Amino acid sequence: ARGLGTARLQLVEFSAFVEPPDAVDSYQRHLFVHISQHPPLESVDVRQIYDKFGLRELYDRGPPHAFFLVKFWADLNWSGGFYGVSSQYESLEHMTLTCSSKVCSFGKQVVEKVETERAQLEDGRFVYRLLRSPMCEYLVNFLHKLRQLPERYMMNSVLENFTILQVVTNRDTQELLLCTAYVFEVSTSERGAQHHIYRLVR
Numbered sequence: 611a612r613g614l615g616t617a618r619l620q621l622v623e624f625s626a627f628v629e630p631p632d633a634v635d636s637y638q639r640h641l642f643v644h645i646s647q648h649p650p651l652e653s654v655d656v657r658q659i660y661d662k663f664g665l666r667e668l669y670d671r672g673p674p675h676a677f678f679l680v681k682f683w684a685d686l687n688w689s690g691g692f693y694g695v696s697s698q699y700e701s702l703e704h705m706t707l708t709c710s711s712k713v714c715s716f717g718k719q720v721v722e723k724v725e726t727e728r729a730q731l732e733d734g735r736f737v738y739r740l741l742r743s744p745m746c747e748y749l750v751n752f753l754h755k756l757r758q759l760p761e762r763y764m765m766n767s768v769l770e771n772f773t774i775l776q777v778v779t780n781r782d783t784q785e786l787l788l789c790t791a792y793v794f795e796v797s798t799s800e801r802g803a804q805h806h807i808y809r810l811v812r
């Protein structure tokens with residue numbers, strides 16, 4: 611694969627953002643993370659991130675190529691605005707998707723989010739839109755609380771135990787389509803949000 615996504619279901623865009631209250635007057639938005647997919651990928655052993663998450667249960671269930679690892683270098687420099695998460699997938703089949711998002715701190719599932727979104731025909735492609743979903747209030751507080759840590763390495767220390775498991779399944783057939791594991795560091799002030807996309811093997 612050359613990017614995040616199987617060839618049965620591919621991730622177009624994924625972003626967690628904030629819009630300040632004066633975005634109505636003049637629109638700006640700040641990206642905590644961002645993936646835009648609109649050279650093959652490097653390999654990471656899934657046995658090496660088992661402790662951070664069920665990943666082993668899902669991986670043995672398969673298929674292996676559906677599993678990806680993304681690390682974010684989040685932008686945490688930017689209160690009371692809207693906090694949003696947007697996801698967008700594309701496929702050549704017409705499916706109904708179930709997208710579970712399990713957020714674990716220290717391996718303990720803190721928040722889980724399950725969503726359903728059915729296909730839409732758009733220019734020879736089937737587009738799945740989960741745009742502008744409000745962020746969990748826990749995650750807004752955690753992002754807030756992480757923001758005034760006095761040191762960058764303390765932020766990285768806390769984020770060492772903070773993981774997100776993305777599970778996208780065909781709702782009708784119950785089969786797994788895409789699985790992404792998110793591991794977090796914090797980017798510097800001068801750099802924006804960044805990602806690297808690995809592929810989980812073995």
Ligand SMILES: *CCC(=O)n1cc2cccc(Nc3cccc(C(F)(F)F)c3)c2c1
Nearest residue numbers: 626642643684695711721723744745746753
């Ligand atoms: C709790 C449900 C929710 O609103 N939600 C669904 C998600 C799916 C995937 C990822 C995230 N959150 C996320 C993504 C990137 C970076 C962050 C961080 F807070 F900046 F660390 C959070 C959510 C949130």
